[PDB]
Design an enzyme around this catalytic site. Structure first.
Site: not given
Length: 330
Positions: A35, A199
């Protein structure tokens, strides 16, 4: 030194991936959920309330000659419905795919939330975010990656998640045969303890690329792709019959629909998520309504590039003094 381990989806929908981890002496092998969105290594154990264990493999510190109780240390990690997993802390030897760390904090669960109990295939979590998020009190503990950094050939690990297929977590090296083209690196902000990056935009299907900054985190521990409401609305508008359902809690679509691909930007590079990756199957057995893999982050407060996005790429987690994230097509 390096390490390499195969990671396997737990079910036919790729809801999560498990990776075998050796803990203790002699080795006790547990299947952990790697994780990158948390920083605790915690396991089901002999100390877990027996009614909260349903098929998981448990870690037994009393059978490990190298286990040491960390006196007075506790840990507590919080979850959605007010549920929490918590317990005490041992140190022990931990090995991932041939890579061994001594004195790693292994957090033994005394109680776990029902959602972990229901999931018999996950024996615990191995956190790979930054160590500032570790919840051990009063002395914060380091992650497996942080403890291994010094002995690694290169201070990196890579995630190569498969679509309905096994994949690979590598530590200490970049496998140049696992991707095509070039790796594009992008800056990481550690201010919140996550692998946080920006992004450069998105496209739906074969539509025009929209240049817009989307700040989010690379999180192998999250199944879906959570993005701003404006982006998610534009995606599902191209799926005939798709709609947001309050009873279900997100966008659903007719299972007979074909889904368009989703492209996200990494610098000047583009990562394309095939439409099939966004199909997460019927909302209930026999239903003709299917659950979408792209959902709104409005209720979450942070954008999450989860497994849906990461498994479309070869992803480099570069833990150098200035950390970066690398993306390559594969």
């Amino acid at each position: 030194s390096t390490g390499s381990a195969t990671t396997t989806p737990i079910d036919s929908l790729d809801d999560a991936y498990i990776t075998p981890v050796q803990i203790g002496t002699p080795a006790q092998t547990l299947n952990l959920d790697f994780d990158t969105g948390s920083s605790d290594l915690w396991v089901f154990s002999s100390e877990t309330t027996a009614s909260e264990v349903d098929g998981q493999t448990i870690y037994t510190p009393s059978k490990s000659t190298t286990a040491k109780l960390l006196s007075g240390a506790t840990w507590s990690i919080s979850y959605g419905d007010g549920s929490s997993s918590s317990g005490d802390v041992y140190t022990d030897t931990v090995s991932v795919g041939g890579l061994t760390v001594t004195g790693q904090a292994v957090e033994s669960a005394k109680k776990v939330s029902s959602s972990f109990t229901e999931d018999s295939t996950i024996d615990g979590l191995l956190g790979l975010a930054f160590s500032t998020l570790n919840t051990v009190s009063p002395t914060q503990q380091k992650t497996f990656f942080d403890n291994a950094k010094a002995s690694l050939d290169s201070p990196v690990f890579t995630a190569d998640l498969g679509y309905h297929a096994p994949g690979t977590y590598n530590f200490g090296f970049i496998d140049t045969t696992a991707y095509t083209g070039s790796i594009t690196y992008t800056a990481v902000s550690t201010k919140q303890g996550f692998w946080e990056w920006t992004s450069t935009g998105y496209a739906v299907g074969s539509g025009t690329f929209k240049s817009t900054s989307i700040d989010g985190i690379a999180d192998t521990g999250t199944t879906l792709l959570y993005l701003p409401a404006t982006v998610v609305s534009a995606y599902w508008a191209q799926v005939s019959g798709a709609k947001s359902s309050s009873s279900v809690g997100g966008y659903v679509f007719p299972c007979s629909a074909t889904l368009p691909s989703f492209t996200f930007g990494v610098g000047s590079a583009r990562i394309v998520i095939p439409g099939d990756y966004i199909d997460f199957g019927p909302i209930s057995t026999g239903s003709s309504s299917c659950f979408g893999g792209i959902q709104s982050s409005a209720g979450i407060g942070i954008n999450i590039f989860g497994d849906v996005a990461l498994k479309a790429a070869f992803v480099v987690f570069n833990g150098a003094t200035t950390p970066t994230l690398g993306f390559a097509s594969k």
